[PDB]
Paper text:
The nap particle is an immunogenic surface adhesion complex from Mycoplasma genitalium. It is essential for motility and responsible for binding sialylated oligosaccharides on the surface of the host cell. Cryo-electron tomography (cryo-ET) of M. genitalium revealed the tetrameric organization of the nap particle complex, consisting of two P140-P110 heterodimers.
We next used the single particle cryo-EM dataset of the purified nap particles to analyze the C-terminal stalks that connect the crown region with the sialic acid binding pocket to the transmembrane helices and the intracellular domain. For this, we analyzed 290,179 heterodimers which allowed the resolving of both stalk domains which had not been possible before, since previous heterodimer constructs were truncated. After classification, two distinct classes showing both the stalk regions of P110 and P140 were solved at resolutions of 3.3 Å and 3.7 Å, respectively. (a) The canonical purified nap particle heterodimer at 3.3 Å agrees with the crystal and (b) the alternative conformation of the P140 stalk at 3.7 Å displays substantial variations in the P140 stalk region.
Residue numbers in the entry:
A (entry chain A): 27 to 255, 261 to 412, 416 to 936
B (entry chain B): 113 to 782, 789 to 1222
Write the structure that this text describes.
C-alpha cells in the first residue's frame, strides 16, 4: 500500500501492482473540514499514521508597529485561515480510508516588546526567483572604510588617523563597508508588499528600500519596461509575477500580499514528526524566521505558537564562528532614540533558508543555509556618511592564518569590521587580506584591529536597523572579495593550500535536535512577555559556496589567480556572467532543498546502534550529514586540523547539475536498500519566463539517486573512530522523461520500482529494474503488468508468459511414475518439496519463484493452488488480499488423486 | 592465416591445463581443455539452477558446450571464483599466440623504431622532421588585425602598447563556409626543402608498424580472441567438473562504447586553431594521435599523421576550414592493446569484470600496450545466459577530483565532456582490500612534456622537445628546454607574425620568458586585458605579456584536476608509457548496476562547425535519453604515491635510493661535497622572497616562519653574494644585440586615470630559472611541478632517469670528477648545470654522481663520464639512459596484505600502499623494498625474471625470481656493430647544442641554444652511449662481470613492517623552518636507518 498524492487535495493508496485501490481516493482537505481554499503542503508516515501539513491561499496576516497582538490574521475579509497539521489513522477493518485523530492548528508568533522594536524597522529583501540575474542580486558598492571613518577628501592620512578609531594597524582603508540600498532588489517592511518586478541591474535599476520612491514613479517605469502577459521590451526590469506565484507567494489580482503573510505562508511548508513532538519549518525558497514545535498531547482547542529563530542560539561549531555571525547583524550600542537591530537586542541569526526537516529515531535533523541579515542605516538626515547603506562586509580568513580548519575559522580576520578588499601578492592578486593578528610585510606592528563601520562621534544620531536578505549572501557589495566569497575562490598560498571559509557568507547550517531541547523550544514559543533563548547543541555550520564552475571565465580555483581574473568582467557581481545549468538564472547564491534522514541498513557491531545519515541536495553537489548514533550527536573526530567530520560535500557531474533544483517535489528513502531518491517534477516550473515568454519545457520529470559512499561508523573494531567524513554520491538514477506528467514513484522492492505517469490525460504504468541504485526500463515486464483489464492486479496469461510467468503441471500419471501410490494425502501434504515435482515453472524475472500450497479434497484426492513471487517480493495466491479487497487473479488451481489409504 | 598456422602447430607441441589442489596442495585432477573427452555442460532446471547432488555431482547433458571446437585449443591464464554462487568458477582463455607473441618472427612483430643498417653512421635526428615553418609570402594580408580603436567604455586606464587582435567568428548563412573564421587565419607554411617538411606516413613509415590483427578481425575470428567460460567444479563428487556458458570477450562490444570524440582523434575541442598550430610546429595534432600511440589503431602507423583529421582542413579559403567530415582513423582495440587488456579478472555479484593486465603479453621495446578499459560480463537468471560488454577507462575516471587523493594535487588526471583524455592502466590487479574494492597498477597521465609550444622559428634548436611532440622520442619526462617556448601555447598562428623582427617583443607572441611579465595591478589589467571586452562573436589575443616557466605553463594548459569533475578545458596529449602509479577504490555496486550499452550525445560530439565551436561551453546539460554521465563516479578515491605535496615530495624523492647501486639520490652522507638532485634544501644560497616581484605582502603569506628565506637551488642567479636576495632587472631581453629590453618605454608603460605613467614590469625577479628552480612565491618562475614529481617518483623507482652527457669515457674526451667539478660554484659554469636539455626538476651533476657516471660511486675505477659546461666554445649534449632497462609497465601481482594495506612488485621494487584505504596523518603511506640481485637489477630485460608475487602465510608478501629466465636481446646485433640497439628503456634522445656558457653570471638568462640539426656527426662518442649495453660496459655491468650469484634462483620478501613503520610525523609539520627543509633534516638524520622509514633491501633466500 503506497500512499501517493493524486493532486493538491486528493491522496490515494496504490497497490504494489501500481494500481489504485477502489474508492481509496479521498479528498483530505474536506476530510479535515477545511474549505476548498486549503491545500496540502507535505505529508509524512510515522507509526503507520499519516500526517499532513495544510496551508491555504486565503490566509492574510497583518503586522502592527504598535500594540500587543502585532502579528495576527486578517479576519476582516474572512482571511483568518491558519495552517493546520492533522494526524490521520487508517481506522477501519482493513482497507485504506482515513479519519480524524488530532488536528493541530498553527498560530502566528507572539512578539515581545524587544522583538517588536527590531521588526518595526526590519525590511526583507524580495525573494530570489528562478529567473533572477546576477546583476539583479548585485548592489552598488557603499562607502569605503576611509570614507565612513575619516570622511571624504581626508586621504593619505589613514595611518595617522586610524589609531583613535580603534582600527589600529588596519591595512585596508579602501575596504568596503557594504552596499547602498538606494537601488537594487526591492526591500520591504514586514507590513509592506514586494513588487512583481525585479531590476536586471541592481546597481542602476530598482529603488530598493525606498518604497515611497518606488511607488511614486519607479514602479510605473518598471511596468512600462515589463508588462504582464509579448509586447514588452525588458531593457531594465523583469516581470517575475509567474515565478513569484509558482514558488509560493500569494497574490491579489497582481500584487503580492504583505510580507508578514508571505513569510507565514512560506514558513508553513515542511513537516517532520516524532513520537513526542511535531516540528514545522519553512521551505528553501525564502527565509523563514519562525518554526513551530507542536506537542502531540496538546489540547485540540489550543494554539501552537512557533519559536523565533532569533531565540534559537544555534551552535555554529566554534564560538568564534557564532560571534562572527552575531557581529554582522548591526551596531550593538545604538541607543539613538529607538534604533534597534538584532545584535543590539541580544539576538542571534534571525533567518535561515531551511533546506528541509526530517526525523529519525525520535531525533529531528534540520539543515539549511544561513540567510543573510545585516544592519542598515535609516537616518535620512546633516546626514550620516553611511546614510542609505547596508552595513555588511566579507569575513574571509586571511592568507596568513595558520592552516587547519579550526585555526581558519577561529582567525579574527573581520571579526568586528571590514578588512578585505583588493591586494597584490607577487605575480598574482589575493582579494583576501594577506595578514591577520600582528603580521605585516616588515615584521610585527601589533594586533590588527577592526570595528563596526559607524563613526563614533555620531553614535547618538545613526539610526541603525536590521534587514533580511533573500539568499545566503551577506555583503552584496559589487566587489571582488564579494564575488570570490560567493564562488569559493579564496585560497591560501602556503604549501598545504586550503580554502579560506567566509565565516559569514554562504554559511550552511545543519544539526540534530533532540526532545530534551525541543521542549525548551516549546517553552520559548509559550514564553510570555520577554523572549527566552533556546540552545541547540548538536548543530554546526560549514561554509559551502556555490561551485566556481557555474560562472563563465572562472575555469578553476587556486591560490595563483590568472591576471585576467582581475578584470571587472569577473571581479564584480554585475559583470559576472552566469552559466548555471541547475535551472537557476543566477550563479552567485547557493540554495539547498530536500533533507531526508535515513537509517543504515547494513549490519553494525553488536552493542552499537545502527548508523543513520542524512543527505541534503545543494547547487552542484550533495552534502551528507554524519551522526554518532551512540550519542545521537554529530560525528566528530579529535584532530581539530581535520575538517568537522560531520560534513562531507560531493560535487556533481553534468547529469545532476542539469537537474533543475527548483522542481523538487518529493524525496523517499528505501529503508531496506539504503538509498535515497530525489524525484523532480518539471510541472512545478512557473508558466512564463522572467521576460514573460511562456515556458516551453514545463513537461517532464526526473529523479536523482543518492547512495552512501566511503567508510561508515562502527563497522569493525578498527572503524570505531573515523577521520574521513562519510561522503555521499549522487547519480542520474535513470528514471527521467520530458514528455510525461508524473504522478508518483513507487519503491516497490529492492530489485524493482515503479513510476506512475500520464502522457495523454490517461494514467500509464512503466516499471524499472533497480540495479542496486540505478534504474533502467524493462519494457517486457511493463506491458505485462499493464494488462490488468481494468482489474486491481494483472491477469494471468494462461497461454503466454507474463509478469506471473508460466506454470505447467505434471500429469497425474507421475504419481505412478515416481511410485507415489504408497504415500498418503497427509504424507504428500507434509512434503512441499515433493509437491515441487508436480509442476514446472518458468519465472518472468530473476529470483522469481513459485510454489504450490495444497489442501485435502477427499480421502484419495487433494486440491492444490499455486503461490507465485511478485515484483514486490510478496507471494500472491488465491487467498491474496491487498488492504482487504481480494485480488481475484484467477490462478489455475489443480486437483490430484490416487493416494492409498495408509 | 599465419597465426592460424601457428596455432595449429602449437596445438601439437604445447599442453596446458588448470589442475585443482586440495587444501593441502595435493593435485586432484587436470582439466586439460585440449584432452578432456566428451565434456558436457551442466544440466539446468527451469529456474536456472544447476542440478547438483554432492556425491553424484553435477548433471551432464552429454553434449559439448558452445564453441567447443574453436575454444578447446586456447590456453588458461586466470581462474576466478564467484562470491555468492557455490561451486561456480570462471576461467580466462587466450590463444597460444598471446603466449608466444614475442617469439614470433620479427617481420610480423615489428618495432616502432628501426635500427637500420647504419651504413651512414647513427644519427637520432634522421627520422625526425625538424625544419621550421616560414612566412607565406602569398598569404601575408590575412594575419589577425590589430584592434582599430580600444573601446574605452569608462576604462580610464590607457595603454600606448599595441592593441589586441580581433578573433571574430560568426555562422553567417553559407552552407560550407563562415562569414568570419578568424581562428582559422593561416599566415604560415611549412619550409620547402627537398619537398615540403611535414608529417606524412607514406614517405616516412615505409615499413609502418601495424598490429597482428585488427579489432574487427579479433571479433570475427573467435579462435584468436580471449574468452571466459563459466564452469562448475566439485572435487569429491563423481561428476567433479562441468561447464556452463562460453562468452567471447568481443572487442567490438568494447569499441562501441568509445566516446564519439574518439572517432576523430586527430582533432580536439579546440579544433582548427590548435590543429594548425601543432601541424606547423610539427607536433602531431589531436588528443590521442597514432603518431604518438600507434598501438590502438587498426592501420597502426600508416595513419600516423595529421592528414584526414575528421574535420576539413588545409582549404585554400580559410573560411571553409573547420567542418566535420568523414573520418578514417578512430581509436580501436587491435591485437596488442586487446591482449594487454585481458587479465586480472574479478567477480562481483552476478557479473564478472576483466580489468586487463600490465600489457607485457605484447609489450615490445618501443611499444607500450596497456589496458584501455574494463570488460564486463553480466549473467542472468542464475548464470543461464550472459551479455558481454566493456567500457573505456576514460569515461570511468572522469569523476576524478583533487579532494579525493591525499597525495599530489593538480595532477593531469582530469577530463571533460569530450573524453579527449585517454587514461589506460598497466593493471597490477583488482582485489578486495577488506571491504573496499581496490584497482591498482600504473596509469598514464595527460601529456605534460609537450604542454609548452616552441616558437615557429625555434624548432631547429630544441630537437629534444620537438621530437617529444613528434612521437619519435617516446619519453614522458619533461625536458627543460625553455628558451624557445612561445609566450602562450594557445595563441593562434594568426598572431605569430604580428611582430616578425622581434624588436618590439610582440605582446601577443614572444619568446616565453617571465622576466618581462606584466604586473597584475588594477591599472595594468584595466588598460591591457579587461578593456577589450569579448562578445559571442569576438575574442581577443590580449596585449598583456603573458609568460611563465614550466609550472605556470602546466597550471594554465594541462588537464590538471579540479574540485569539480569533467572540468579540464586543456588536454594536450596522453603519456606514452604509464608515468604514474595509481590505486583507486572502485564502486562495486555502481559497477554491478551500470547498463551494458552506453549512450553518448551531441554534448560529447565535437562542435560541428567553428560557429558553434566558438561559444562552446565546457559543461552542457546531458541529453535526456543519454546515460554516459552515469559512469563518471566509479572512482571512490585514488592515490599515486606517498601522501605528500609540494617540495616535500621532492625531498622524499631525495630519500629513496637508486637500485642500480643503492646509493641515495641525495648523496647526503658525504667543501665541494656532492649536492642533492631533486630537493633544493642546502643547495645554492638562501634568498628572501619578500624582495621578489612586487616586493609587497609576502613576509608571512608563503612562509609561516618569521624569516621567509628560500633555498634558490642549483643554477641560481645573483648580482653578488652581498645581494643574494632577489635579482634586479638585469635579465634584459634583447631581440638582436640591439640594447636591453628597455623598460620605462612608452610601449611598456600604462597611463591610469589622469596619465600618471609607470612601468609595467617588476623591479626584482626570483633568483633562479634553473630546471630545479622552486618558488612557492612565484608560480610564473617556478619549474618544479607535481606532474613532474609523480613521473620522477615512478621513474626513480624504476631506476631509468636519463642524464645529460657532454663527455663520454673515451680517451681525450674524459670528464674529470676532480679539478673540473666544483659543487660550491653552482652559479658559474664550474657547476656544470646544463640548464638546457636536462630533465626538469633535477640537477644533472647530482644525478650523474648518484649514477656514478663520474667517480667511483658505481664502479671501482672512475668511468669519467659527465657533463661539462664549456665556456671556450659551443657545447653539444645528449640524454642517455641510466643503464637499467626497467620499464614503467613492469608491475606484478596485486597482493593484499591485510584489511588496510596492499602492494605489488614494481620493477625492481616491491611497493606496498600502507595508508591508502585508511590513511593516517603524518605517515608517508608507502613502504618500498628493493631487490638485492645485481644480475636482475642490471639485466637487459629484467622483468622476464619476475615469476609472480603472493602473500605468504607468515603475513609478508614475496616475489619469485629466476635469474636464469632472463631473455636476452633478439640477436647479437646480427654480425655488425648496431649503434642503435633497441631495449625497453631505449629512447632516441635528440642532440642539444648550446652556446658557450658565461664564466660569470652563467644563469642570469635562459641558456640559449643554437641549431643542433648538424651536431649529430660531431658527437659519436656520446651517441654511442644511447644504447644501454654501452653504458653497462662503461660501468662494468656489461656482462657476467657483474658476478655474484651465478644461478641464484630464489624468492625475495618485503621488509618487515610494524605500526611505527612509515611514521614521518616528526619530519612533517612546521615550527622553525619550511616543511621541505624540516623533512630534509629529518631524512638526513636517518640516512643509516632507512628501514623505519619504509625503505630497505628485500630479504632474499635461495631456492634450488
Amino acid at each position: 500500500t503506497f500512499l501517493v498524492k493524486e493532486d493538491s487535495k486528493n491522496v490515494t493508496a496504490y497497490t504494489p501492482f501500481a494500481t489504485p485501490i477502489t474508492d481509496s481516493k479521498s479528498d483530505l482537505v474536506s476530510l479535515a473540514q477545511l474549505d476548498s481554499s486549503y491545500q496540502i503542503a507535505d505529508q509524512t508516515i510515522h507509526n503507520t499514521n499519516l500526517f499532513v501539513l495544510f496551508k491555504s491561499r486565503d490566509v492574510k496576516v497583518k503586522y502592527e508597529s504598535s500594540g500587543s497582538n502585532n502579528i495576527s490574521f486578517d479576519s476582516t475579509s474572512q482571511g483568518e485561515k491558519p495552517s493546520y497539521v492533522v494526524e490521520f489513522t487508517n481506522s477501519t477493518n482493513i482497507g485504506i480510508k482515513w479519519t480524524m485523530v488530532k488536528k493541530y492548528q498553527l498560530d502566528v508568533p507572539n512578539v515581545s516588546s524587544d522583538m517588536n522594536q527590531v521588526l518595526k524597522n526590519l525590511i526583507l529583501e524580495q525573494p530570489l526567483t528562478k529567473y533572477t540575474l546576477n546583476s539583479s542580486l548585485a548592489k552598488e558598492k557603499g562607502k569605503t572604510q576611509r570614507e565612513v571613518h575619516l570622511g571624504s577628501g581626508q586621504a593619505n592620512q589613514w595611518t595617522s588617523q586610524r589609531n583613535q578609531h580603534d582600527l589600529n594597524n588596519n591595512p585596508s582603508p579602501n575596504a568596503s563597508t557594504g552596499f547602498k540600498l538606494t537601488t537594487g532588489n526591492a526591500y520591504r517592511k514586514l507590513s509592506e508588499s514586494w513588487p512583481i518586478y525585479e531590476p536586471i541591474d541592481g546597481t542602476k535599476q530598482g529603488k530598493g528600500k525606498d518604497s515611497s520612491g518606488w511607488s511614486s514613479t519607479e514602479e510605473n517605469e518598471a511596468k512600462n519596461d515589463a508588462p504582464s502577459v509579448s509586447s514588452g521590451t525588458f531593457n531594465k526590469y523583469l516581470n517575475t509575477k509567474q515565478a513569484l506565484e509558482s514558488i509560493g507567494i500569494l497574490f491579489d489580482d497582481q500584487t503580492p500580499r504583505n510580507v508578514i503573510t508571505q513569510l507565514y505562508y512560506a514558513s508553513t511548508s515542511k513537516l517532520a514528526v516524532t513520537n513526542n513532538h511535531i516540528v514545522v519549518m519553512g521551505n528553501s525558497f525564502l527565509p523563514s524566521m519562525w518554526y513551530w514545535v507542536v506537542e502531540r498531547s496538546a489540547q485540540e482547542n489550543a494554539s501552537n505558537k512557533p519559536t523565533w529563530f532569533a531565540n534559537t542560539n544555534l551552535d555554529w561549531g566554534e564560538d568564534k564562528q557564532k560571534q562572527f555571525v552575531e557581529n554582522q547583524l548591526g551596531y550593538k550600542e545604538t541607543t539613538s532614540t529607538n534604533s534597534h537591530n538584532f545584535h543590539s537586542k541580544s539576538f542571534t541569526q534571525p533567518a535561515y533558508l531551511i533546506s528541509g526537516i526530517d526525523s529519525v529515531n525520535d531525533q529531528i535533523i534540520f539543515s539549511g543555509f544561513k540567510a543573510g541579515s545585516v544592519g542598515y542605516d535609516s537616518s535620512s538626515s546633516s546626514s550620516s556618511s553611511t546614510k542609505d547603506q547596508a552595513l555588511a562586509w566579507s569575513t574571509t580568513t586571511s592568507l596568513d592564518s595558520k592552516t587547519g580548519y579550526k585555526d581558519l575559522v577561529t582567525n579574527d580576520t573581520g571579526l568586528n569590521g571590514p578588512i578585505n578588499g583588493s591586494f597584490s601578492i607577487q605575480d598574482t592578486f589575493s582579494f583576501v587580506v594577506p595578514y591577520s593578528g600582528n603580521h605585516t610585510n616588515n615584521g610585527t606592528t601589533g594586533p590588527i584591529k577592526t570595528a563596526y563601520p559607524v563613526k563614533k562621534d555620531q553614535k547618538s544620531t545613526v539610526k541603525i536597523n536590521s534587514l533580511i536578505n533573500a539568499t545566503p549572501l551577506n555583503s552584496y557589495g559589487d566587489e571582488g572579495i564579494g564575488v570570490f566569497d560567493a564562488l569559493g575562490l579564496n585560497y591560501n598560498f602556503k604549501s598545504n593550500q586550503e580554502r579560506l571559509p567566509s565565516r559569514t557568507d554562504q554559511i550552511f547550517v545543519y544539526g540534530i535536535v533532540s526532545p530534551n531541547e525541543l521542549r525548551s523550544a516549546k517553552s520559548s514559543a509559550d514564553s510570555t512577555g520577554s523572549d527566552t533563548k533556546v540552545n541547540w547543541s548538536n548543530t554546526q555550520s560549514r561554509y559551502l559556496p556555490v561551485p566556481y564552475n557555474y560562472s563563465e571565465g572562472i575555469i578553476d580555483a587556486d591560490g595563483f589567480k590568472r591576471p585576467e581574473n582581475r578584470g571587472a568582467s569577473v571581479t564584480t557581481f554585475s559583470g559576472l556572467k552566469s552559466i548555471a545549468p541547475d535551472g537557476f538564472a543566477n550563479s552567485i547564491a547557493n540554495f539547498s532543498v530536500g533533507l531526508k534522514a535515513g537509517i543504515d541498513p547494513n549490519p553494525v557491531m553488536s552493542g552499537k546502534k545502527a548508523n543513520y545519515g542524512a543527505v541534503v541536495l545543494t547547487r552542484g553537489g550533495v552534502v551528507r550529514l554524519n551522526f554518532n548514533p551512540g550519542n545521537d550527536s554529530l560525528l566528530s573526530t579529535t584532530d581539530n586540523n581535520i575538517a568537522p567530520i560531520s560534513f562531507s560535500f560531493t560535487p556533481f557531474t553534468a547529469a545532476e547539475s542539469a537537474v533543475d533544483l527548483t522542481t523538487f517535489k518529493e524525496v523517499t528513502y528505501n529503508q531496506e536498500s539504503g538509498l535515497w531518491s530525489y524525484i523532480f517534477d518539471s510541472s512545478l516550473k512557473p508558466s512564463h519566463d522572467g521576460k514573460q515568454t511562456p515556458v516551453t519545457d514545463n513537461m517532464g520529470f526526473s529523479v536523482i539517486t543518492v547512495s552512501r559512499t566511503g567508510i561508515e561508523l562502527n563497522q569493525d573494531q578498527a572503524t570505531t573512530t573515523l577521520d574521513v567524513a562519510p561522503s555521499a554520491l549522487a547519480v542520474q538514477s535513470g528514471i527521467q522523461s520530458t514528455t510525461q506528467t508524473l504522478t508518483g514513484v513507487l519503491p516497490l522492492s529492492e530489485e524493482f520500482s515503479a513510476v506512475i505517469a500520464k502522457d495523454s490525460d490517461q494514467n500509464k504504468i512503466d516499471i524499472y529494474k533497480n540495479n542496486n541504485g540505478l534504474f533502467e526500463i524493462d519494457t517486457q515486464l511493463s506491458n505485462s503488468v499493464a494488462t490488468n483489464n481494468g482489474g486491481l492486479a494483472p491477469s494471468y496469461t494462461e497461454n503466454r508468459v507474463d509478469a506471473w510467468g508460466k506454470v505447467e503441471f505434471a500429469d497425474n500419471s507421475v504419481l505412478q511414475a515416481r511410485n507415489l501410490v504408497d504415500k498418503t494425502v497427509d504424507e504428500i501434504i507434509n512434503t512441499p518439496e515433493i509437491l515441487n515435482s508436480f509442476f514446472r515453472f518458468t519465472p518472468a524475472f530473476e529470483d522469481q519463484k513459485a510454489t504450490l500450497v495444497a489442501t485435502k479434497q477427499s480421502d484419495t484426492s487433494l486440491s492444490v493452488s499455486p503461490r507465485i513471487q511478485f515484483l514486490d517480493g510478496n507471494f500472491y495466491d488465491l487467498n491474496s488480499t491487498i488492504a482487504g479487497v481480494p485480488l481475484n487473479i484467477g490462478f489455475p488451481s489443480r486437483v490430484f488423486a490416487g493416494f492409498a489409504a495408509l | 592465416k599465419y597465426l592460424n598456422a601457428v596455432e595449429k602447430y602449437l596445438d601439437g607441441q604445447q599442453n596446458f591445463a588448470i589442475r585443482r589442489y586440495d587444501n593441502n596442495g595435493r593435485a586432484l585432477y587436470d582439466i586439460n581443455l585440449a584432452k578432456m573427452e566428451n565434456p558436457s555442460t551442466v544440466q539446468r532446471g527451469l529456474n536456472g539452477e544447476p542440478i547438483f547432488d554432492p556425491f553424484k555431482g553435477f548433471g551432464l547433458t552429454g553434449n559439448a558446450p558452445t564453441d567447443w571446437n574453436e575454444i578447446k585449443g586456447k590456453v588458461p591464464v586466470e581462474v576466478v571464483q564467484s562470491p555468492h554462487s557455490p561451486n561456480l568458477y570462471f576461467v580466462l582463455l587466450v590463444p597460444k599466440v598471446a603466449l608466444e607473441y614475442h617469439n614470433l618472427n620479427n617481420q610480423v612483430v615489428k618495432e616502432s623504431l628501426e635500427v637500420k643498417a647504419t651504413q651512414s653512421s647513427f644519427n637520432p635526428t634522421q627520422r625526425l622532421q625538424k625544419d621550421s615553418p616560414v612566412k607565406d609570402s602569398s598569404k601575408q594580408g590575412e594575419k589577425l588585425s590589430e584592434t582599430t580603436a580600444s573601446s574605452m567604455s569608462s576604462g580610464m586606464a590607457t595603454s600606448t602598447r599595441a592593441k589586441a587582435l580581433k578573433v571574430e567568428v560568426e555562422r553567417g548563412s553559407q552552407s560550407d563556409s563562415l562569414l568570419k573564421n578568424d581562428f582559422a587565419k593561416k599566415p604560415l607554411k611549412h619550409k620547402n626543402s627537398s619537398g615540403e617538411v611535414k608529417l606524412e606516413a607514406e614517405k616516412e613509415f615505409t615499413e609502418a608498424w601495424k598490429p597482428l590483427l585488427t579489432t574487427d578481425q579479433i571479433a570475427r575470428e573467435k579462435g584468436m580472441g580471449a574468452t571466459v567460460v563459466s564452469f562448475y567444479d566439485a572435487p569429491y563428487s563423481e561428476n567433479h567438473t562441468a561447464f556452463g556458458l562460453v562468452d567471447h570477450i568481443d572487442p567490438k562490444k568494447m569499441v562501441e562504447n568509445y566516446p564519439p570524440s574518439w572517432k576523430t582523434p586527430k582533432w580536439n575541442h579546440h579544433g582548427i586553431w590548435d590543429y594548425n598550430a601543432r601541424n606547423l610546429l610539427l607536433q602531431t595534432t589531436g588528443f590521442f594521435n597514432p603518431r604518438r600511440h600507434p598501438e590502438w589503431f587498426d592501420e597502426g602507423q600508416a595513419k600516423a599523421d595529421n592528414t584526414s583529421p575528421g574535420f576539413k582542413v588545409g582549404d585554400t579559403d580559410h573560411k571553409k576550414d573547420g567542418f566535420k567530415k568523414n573520418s578514417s582513423s578512430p581509436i580501436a582495440l587491435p591485437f596488442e592493446a586487446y591482449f594487454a587488456n585481458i587479465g586480472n579478472m574479478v567477480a562481483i555479484g552476478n557479473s564478472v569484470f576483466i580489468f586487463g593486465g600490465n600489457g607485457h603479453a605484447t609489450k615490445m621495446f618501443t611499444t607500450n600496450p596497456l589496458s584501455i578499459g574494463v570488460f564486463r560480463i553480466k549473467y542472468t537468471d542464475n548464470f543461464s545466459k550472459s551479455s558481454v560488454t566493456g567500457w573505456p577507462y576514460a569515461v570511468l575516471f572522469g569523476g576524478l577530483i583533487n579532494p579525493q587523493t591525499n597525495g599530489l594535487k593538480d595532477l593531469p588526471l582530469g577530463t571533460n565532456r569530450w573524453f579527449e583524455y585517454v587514461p589506460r592502466m598497466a593493471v597490477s590487479g583488482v582485489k578486495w582490500v577488506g571491504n573496499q574494492l581496490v584497482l591498482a597498477g600504473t596509469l598514464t597521465m595527460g601529456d605534460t612534456a609537450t604542454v609548452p609550444r616552441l616558437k615557429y622559428d625555434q624548432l631547429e634548436k630544441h630537437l629534444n622537445l620537438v621530437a617529444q611532440g613528434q612521437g619519435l622520442l617516446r619519453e614522458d619526462l619533461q625536458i627543460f628546454t625553455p628558451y624557445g617556448w612561445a609566450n602562450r601555447p594557445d595563441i593562434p598562428v594568426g598572431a605569430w607574425l604580428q611582430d616578425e623582427m622581434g624588436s618590439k617583443f610582440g605582446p601577443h607572441y614572444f619568446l616565453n620568458n617571465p622576466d618581462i611579465q606584466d604586473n597584475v595591478n588594477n591599472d595594468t589589467v584595466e588598460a591591457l586585458i579587461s578593456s577589450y571586452k569579448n562578445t559571442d562573436k569576438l575574442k581577443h589575443v590580449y596585449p598583456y605579456r603573458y609568460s611563465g616557466l614550466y609550472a605556470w605553463q602546466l597550471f594554465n594548459w594541462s588537464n590538471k584536476l579540479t574540485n569539480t569533475p569533467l572540468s579540464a578545458n586543456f588536454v594536450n596529449e596522453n603519456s606514452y608509457a604509464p608515468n604514474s602509479l595509481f590505486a583507486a577504490i572502485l564502486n562495486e555496486d555502481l559497477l554491478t548496476g551500470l547498463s551494458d550499452k552506453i549512450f553518448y550525445g551531441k554534448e560529447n560530439e565535437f562542435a560541428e562547425n567553428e560557429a558553434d565551436r566558438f561559444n562552446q561551453l565546457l559543461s552542457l546539460n546531458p541529453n535526456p535519453n543519454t546515460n554516459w554521465a552515469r559512469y563518471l563516479n566509479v572512482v571512490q578515491r585514488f592515490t599515486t604515491g606517498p601522501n605528500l605535496d609540494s617540495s616535500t615530495f621532492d625531498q622524499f624523492l631525495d630519500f629513496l635510493p637508486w637500485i642500480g647501486n643503492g646509493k641515495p639520490f641525495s648523496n647526503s652522507p658525504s667543501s665541494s661535497t656532492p649536492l642533492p638532485t631533486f630537493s633544493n634544501i642546502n643547495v645554492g644560497v638562501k634568498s628572501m622572497i619578500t624582495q621578489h616581484l612586487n616586493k609587497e605582502n609576502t613576509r608571512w603569506v608563503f612562509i609561516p616562519n618569521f624569516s621567509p628565506d628560500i633555498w634558490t637551488g642549483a643554477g641560481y642567479r645573483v648580482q653578488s653574494a652581498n645581494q643574494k636576495n632577489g635579482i634586479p632587472f638585469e635579465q634584459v631581453k634583447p631581440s638582436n644585440n640591439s640594447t636591453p629590453f628597455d623598460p620605462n618605454s612608452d610601449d611598456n608603460k600604462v597611463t591610469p586615470s589622469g596619465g600618471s605613467s609607470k612601468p609595467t614590469t617588476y623591479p626584482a625577479l626570483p633568483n633562479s630559472i634553473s630546471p630545479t628552480s622552486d618558488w612557492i612565491n612565484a608560480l610564473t618562475f617556478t619549474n618544479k611541478n607535481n606532474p613532474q614529481r609523480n613521473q620522477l617518483l615512478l621513474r626513480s623507482l624504476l631506476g631509468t632517469i636519463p642524464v645529460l652527457i657532454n663527455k663520454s669515457g673515451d680517451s681525450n674526451d674524459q670528464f674529470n670528477k676532480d679539478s673540473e667539478q666544483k659543487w660550491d660554484k653552482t652559479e658559474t659554469n664550474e657547476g656544470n648545470l646544463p640548464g638546457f636539455g636536462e630533465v626538469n626538476g633535477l640537477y644533472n651533476a647530482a644525478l650523474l654522481h648518484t649514477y656514478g657516471f663520474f667517480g667511483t660511486n658505481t664502479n671501482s675505477t672512475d668511468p669519467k663520464i659527465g657533463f661539462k659546461a664549456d665556456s671556450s666554445s659551443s657545447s653539444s649534449s645528449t640524454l642517455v639512459g641510466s643503464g637499467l632497462n626497467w620499464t614503467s609497465q613492469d608491475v606484478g601481482n596485486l597482493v593484499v596484505i591485510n584489511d588496510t594495506s596492499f602492494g605489488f612488485q614494481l620493477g625492481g621494487w616491491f611497493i606496498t600502499f600502507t595508508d591508502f584505504i585508511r590513511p593516517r596523518t603524518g605517515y608517508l603511506g608507502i613502504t618500498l623494498s628493493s631487490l638485492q640481485d645485481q644480475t636482475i637489477i642490471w639485466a637487459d630485460q629484467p622483468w622476464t625474471s619476475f615469476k609472480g608475487s603472493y602473500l605468504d602465510s607468515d603475513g609478508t608478501p614475496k616475489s619469485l625470481w629466476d635469474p636464469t629466465a632472463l631473455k636476452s636481446l633478439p640477436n647479437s646485433s646480427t654480425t655488425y656493430d648496431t649503434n642503435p640497439t633497441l631495449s625497453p628503456s631505449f629512447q632516441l634522445y635528440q642532440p642539444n647544442k648550446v652556446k658557450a656558457y658565461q664564466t660569470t653570471n652563467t644563469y642570469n638568462k635562459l641558456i640559449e641554444p643554437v641549431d643542433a640539426t648538424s651536431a649529430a656527426t660531431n658527437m659519436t662518442s656520446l651517441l654511442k652511449l644511447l644504447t644501454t649495453k654501452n653504458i653497462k660496459a662503461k660501468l662494468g655491468k656489461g656482462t657476467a662481470s657483474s658476478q655474484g650469484n651465478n644461478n641464484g634462483g630464489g624468492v625475495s620478501q618485503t621488509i618487515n613492517t610494524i605500526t611505527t613503520t612509515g611514521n614521518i610525523s616528526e619530519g612533517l609539520k612546521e615550527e622553525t623552518s619550511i616543511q621541505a627543509e624540516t623533512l630534509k633534516k629529518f631524512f638526513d638524520s636517518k640516512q643509516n636507518n632507512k628501514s623505519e622509514i619504509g625503505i630497505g633491501d628485500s630479504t632474499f633466500t635461495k631456492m634450488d
